[PDB]
Write a protein that binds this ligand. Structure first.
Ligand SMILES: *[C@@H]1O[C@H](CO)[C@@H](O[C@@H]2O[C@H](CO)[C@@H](O)[C@H](O)[C@H]2NC(C)=O)[C@H](O)[C@H]1NC(C)=O
Ligand SMILES: *[C@@H]1O[C@H](CO)[C@@H](O[C@@H]2O[C@H](CO)[C@@H](O)[C@H](O)[C@H]2NC(C)=O)[C@H](O)[C@H]1NC(C)=O
Ligand SMILES: *[C@@H]1O[C@H](CO)[C@@H](O[C@@H]2O[C@H](CO)[C@@H](O)[C@H](O)[C@H]2NC(C)=O)[C@H](O)[C@H]1NC(C)=O
Lengths: 324, 164, 324, 170, 165, 324
């Protein structure tokens, strides 16, 4: 009669590492590292992401002709640019505080586009047509931004213009506009008609006075002239007043914004699909409850802490010794 | 092993027993068989389960984390931002790996200890009524049946003995 | 005859947590987490903090009429804003590099206010009175900043002004001025008699030209006009020059700063009391030598490392098992 | 217990021993009583004290830590700054808690080890002259008075001075 | 010690044994001498050598890390940048020291455990044929020769016995 | 007959620290903390660092008369400023985005200096001489930057100048220029001849127009006027155009840049020597494979992680107890 004390074993081939010894076969163990994604960009809370396509934030918000599919967009879970998002600012020039504007869009869940200054009723004393360019061509013909209006002189006359807008939308109104800088003094007259023009813009927290920087520059997209893009969030109840004697790319359409955390902008070439997830990465979605993942640093939703590790297996059972 | 039980004075484990982590063999006049200790495998499971959950709670998950853009005259701010991201990534990667390595060491030694502690709970229950062979095996002096065996793996021996 | 070996036990109910087991009652333990404060804002090194009250840094430094109690402030341990610090810039406009200025004030322990350009002796050729506004009203009547002086034309005449100051204080001087931007050219003339004005300001390390940005804007505190506020630290022995053909809100009073690390600005609604401390937080003071505290991240003085933990108790004694 | 001593083969603790962490209780013909072991209780105190002081030194204090303001066009810079504060708070909260959890384990297993080592130091002093009962108790074979008791909790037993044990051994 | 072997029931170490970490003395009718245990000493060296290498792998080296200049209106950015560098320095200095302190405790307890496990591998090999003196010493009952000694420090005793009460 | 189990011991006096006990003599230990340097500034990959000496980046790039030794410089492993690097901008003024330019020179391994606008062929209608100053004196005589050219009026005439450069270097071209700001309208005339002058610069991504800011300022190095320095990185194939009716400090020499990571700028007073290393710090070089070092935070190459530790000795052997 005997009795022996011993321990468990099995066919498990799971190896873990310790500080003293590597590749130690154990009987049980949990994996802490998620490394399997979806390969697909999915919805979040049932709401689909916004594909920009061959367009970037600038193009979309400005109304670049190549970005007409996006005119419909009103709500999104997150915004997605790609490797080919190059259609942004078709007329050469600076987009002042562009990176900052993007940072703002990051906390926007949706907006309500609207005509802030109706093109066919806001400018009785100025040329509302003729404001097109080969740089912004559409369908083979010269065109322009869909959300902006390039004003010009009405038969050799450009009377000072004043035009205000009061915010009654009960939210922030994103107002964009531009100031044109001709190459020569000749073009300045042909366009505006006043050689010494100016553009002034004022709200409760915004006050700035732009003046034409006439100069000769290398042609970019066939333009020696430049166009500088500006913006501002108009607060609920606040007025914004435009004054100009020329060079004004007036706002046509605006955006009444809706805030919402948990949003953001990613760059991905992965395809969008009709699926739902609580975690999104540039490579794909993640359906897991593991503490870690080595897929991607960039994340949207509730995700596991990103880590460089290749393997994070922690032991739960004992050292495995079948000794058959 | 740290406690010299597993892979020690008990050279191997038993692929047989499949109802627990630690246990007994017992070869009687009525037959053989395996039997796992409810007492000790339960405590071990409650413990390991708890160690894992503790580690997970500490590692708070990761909400929306996107990148920022910088223009060409913001290269210092861009590199600062980059130094922060790579910085925290270095640290969390190091913590995560380092923690596992350490707790795995703690975990294997935890088992080793448990096997050891069980063997010596039995040894201090039998004393004269059995001798230590080698591979953590006790040879009876007083012939113990199936009803008697279940008193040992119970923590309730009785010690009525003789020769020897 | 016998002898037993055993271990200590007592009525102690202190519990601690380990990795394997929770709520483990032990015989002895030390608490590492400080969670008790003072409820009061106290002195530091015997020096009381500076109460801004319903004023903020801007109001205090410019000399906003509502902030007259601070005119006596000379030395402080740390600066305190409240939830009602809304009295700063009373004439609408931008305070250029205002957040940076606050960053500077954080390492300033005290200063000596002084009259850099005495009102009744510096401007023999400009109007030194009349520089008042309803926006900066005081005692039911129109007034203006105390440390600033709004120069206007002297009877339809605004001669070019030039005025320099040399820093003989053996410290850095904080100089503040302003530039006024009228709503219309009519006002520009009424105020400056000089339709094409400029403001130039330069020391050894500062040089910047300001120009009137006349324009129509929404009224803020009844003002379509705007006022930008500027500042500079004049190094010891350095000169600062002011030239203007209009629109200059001239410096009246400056400040000779005294540097001192270990100071800062906090936001708190907790009351000031005649007590001392080596550690101050927005919630209150802390008299402790513990390594940690979960009271607040914002700290002044020598304080325990802040942490989110609710409990941090480490075991010193052994398991407590009375087993009565 | 990791060493099976505390809450192990010695099931309970003694509320009666109040002058130390580990000790003995003898029962004599002269009477009973408790007595703590200086040698081993002092080394534990010195070690634990040391452990705590080591912990505190590594967690250096926090000097003046105030927040920064940003305007409406420094939202990226404001969020970078916010990311760094929350970033460091996450790590230091983690370390502080994780450190205590680990060291609490190490500490309790430390006491366990101490009790075990004391017990086995006595067992190796006595050998034949006494028999192991169970709950860390030794029953004498040679009758040990108060004088002799102190010699054991002194590390200076005189084994060969006893073969009266051999007698009572049967 | 945590296992009470080193600086414990074996009060001291042998300056005489120079070919290994753990070993035997053995005093015979043929002579004395020392002898280190290959089996257990090698396993330790492999274990420690592995512990050190694991620490180094984890601490990735440091590439070009230079500082940045900021103008007099970039104090918030200069301080932010300074807060980051001192922040990361605090953490790594902490991890570095804290790691050594902990592992050193684990390493000394490792050796302790090893000596203990060896002693008791011998003890369960001899049983009756010898008696435990004190300082980790076994006194033989059946007189063992140089040829017999090498059977013990080999894990291959044979237990031919009789005793001597 | 007997047999004893024991352990090793030796004369080693190495001590380590544990959490429970300090200064514990052991038998074997490794040192993890490198604390020995070279006291010398050495080559990296066989290439020598660039000594700026009494000159800083600006002095070197502009061509300060005191930095003539750096004219030859073409390639470097890293850039070294000293405690005496004071010679940079010799004429008083601002160096726009200097800190950013420095950040750009950090990732530049070498460049090819070339004559972008040959002094003796580019300006047929302007005074290419006479553009010297006492502030920038060299050899007791008034001089000027080596890489810039101070254009002045040619006998009471300063015709509009236009001058472009197309980048054919297939690399980035760093172009520096300056804009002069005289003290008085008189000097403006003596120098340029046009009271109302301007300087215009335009590339594919750079567009900016400069107007003379005439005013009296505190004399620096004898100068009451100011001079602002600008720079831009001209992309391969892009063109840069300079237009001016005065006040232009035109580019003379430019730089064709070769990028390359791993480089940087350091401040050191340690001497340069003919050695080679894989790790460099301000204090000196490091030949070590330890994971840590307490020498310096600032590093160039492959270096041990910097730590504030004074000692990092990790135990390998056992507790050393000879007990002779
Ligand atoms: C929209 O984006 C495309 C892609 O960048 C632009 O196409 C480029 O136009 C330039 C300017 O003539 C050409 O030199 C490139 O060769 C074109 N690239 C490709 C891939 O076609 C296009 O011009 C953009 N259109 C608008 C209105 O922005
Ligand atoms: C000082 O601050 C108070 C409180 O904000 C200002 O009072 C407000 O003024 C605005 C504009 O006139 C009113 O719309 C609010 O109703 C007022 N609020 C309160 C609580 O009174 C006050 O105007 C400021 N005064 C100065 C001189 O700066
Ligand atoms: C180069 O730098 C040196 C050091 O700053 C300059 O020398 C000093 O110039 C200042 C200002 O004129 C004088 O007050 C000091 O007396 C000078 N010190 C020394 C040691 O000479 C020098 O003028 C600079 N030269 C150039 C061309 O920039």
């Amino acid at each position: 009669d005997t009795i022996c004390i011993g321990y468990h074993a099995n066919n498990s081939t799971d190896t873990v590492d310790t500080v003293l010894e590597k590749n130690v076969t154990v009987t049980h163990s949990v994996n802490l590292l998620e490394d399997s994604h979806n390969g697909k960009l999915c919805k979040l809370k049932g709401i689909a992401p916004l594909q920009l396509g061959k367009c970037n934030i600038a193009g979309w918000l400005l109304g670049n002709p190549e970005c007409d599919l996006l005119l419909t967009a009103s709500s999104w879970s997150y915004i997605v640019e790609t490797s080919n998002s190059e259609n942004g600012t078709c007329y050469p020039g600076d987009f002042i505080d562009y990176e900052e504007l993007r940072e703002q869009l990051s906390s926007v869940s949706s907006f309500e586009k609207f005509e802030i200054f109706p093109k066919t009723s806001s400018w009785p004393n100025h040329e509302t047509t003729k404001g097109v360019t080969a740089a912004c061509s559409y369908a083979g013909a010269s065109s322009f931004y869909r959300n902006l209006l390039w004003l010009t002189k009405k038969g050799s006359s450009y009377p000072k213009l004043s035009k205000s807008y009061v915010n009654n939308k009960g939210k922030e109104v994103l107002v964009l506009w531009g100031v044109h800088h001709p190459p020569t003094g000749t073009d300045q007259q042909s366009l505006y008609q006043n050689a010494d023009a100016y553009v002034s813009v004022g709200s409760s927290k915004y006050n700035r006075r732009f003046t034409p920087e006439i100069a000769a520059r290398p042609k970019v997209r066939g333009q020696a002239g430049r166009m500088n893009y500006y913006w501002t969030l108009l607060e609920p109840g606040d007025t914004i007043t435009f004054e100009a004697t020329g060079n004004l790319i007036a706002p046509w359409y605006a955006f009444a914004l809706n805030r919402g955390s948990g949003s953001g902008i990613i760059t991905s070439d992965a395809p969008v699909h009709d699926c739902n997830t609580k975690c999104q990465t540039p490579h794909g979605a993640i359906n897991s409850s593991l503490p870690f993942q080595n897929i991607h640093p960039v994340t949207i939703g509730e995700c596991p802490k990103y880590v460089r590790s290749t393997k994070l297996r922690m032991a739960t059972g004992l050292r495995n010794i079948p000794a058959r | 092993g740290l406690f010299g039980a597993i892979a020690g004075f008990i050279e191997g484990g038993w692929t047989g027993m499949i109802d627990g982590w630690y246990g007994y063999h017992h070869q009687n006049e009525q037959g053989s068989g395996y039997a796992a200790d409810q007492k000790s495998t339960q405590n071990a499971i409650d413990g390991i389960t708890n160690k894992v959950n503790s580690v997970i709670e500490k590692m708070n998950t990761q909400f929306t984390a996107v990148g920022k853009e910088f223009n060409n005259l913001e290269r210092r701010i861009e590199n600062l931002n980059k130094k922060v991201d790579d910085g925290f990534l270095d640290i969390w990667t190091y913590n995560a790996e380092l923690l596992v390595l350490l707790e795995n060491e703690r975990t294997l030694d935890f088992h080793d200890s448990n096997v050891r502690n069980l063997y010596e709970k039995v040894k201090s229950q039998l004393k004269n009524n059995a001798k230590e062979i080698g591979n953590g095996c006790f040879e009876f002096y007083h012939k113990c049946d199936d009803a008697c065996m279940e008193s040992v793996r119970n923590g309730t021996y009785d010690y009525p003995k003789y020769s020897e």
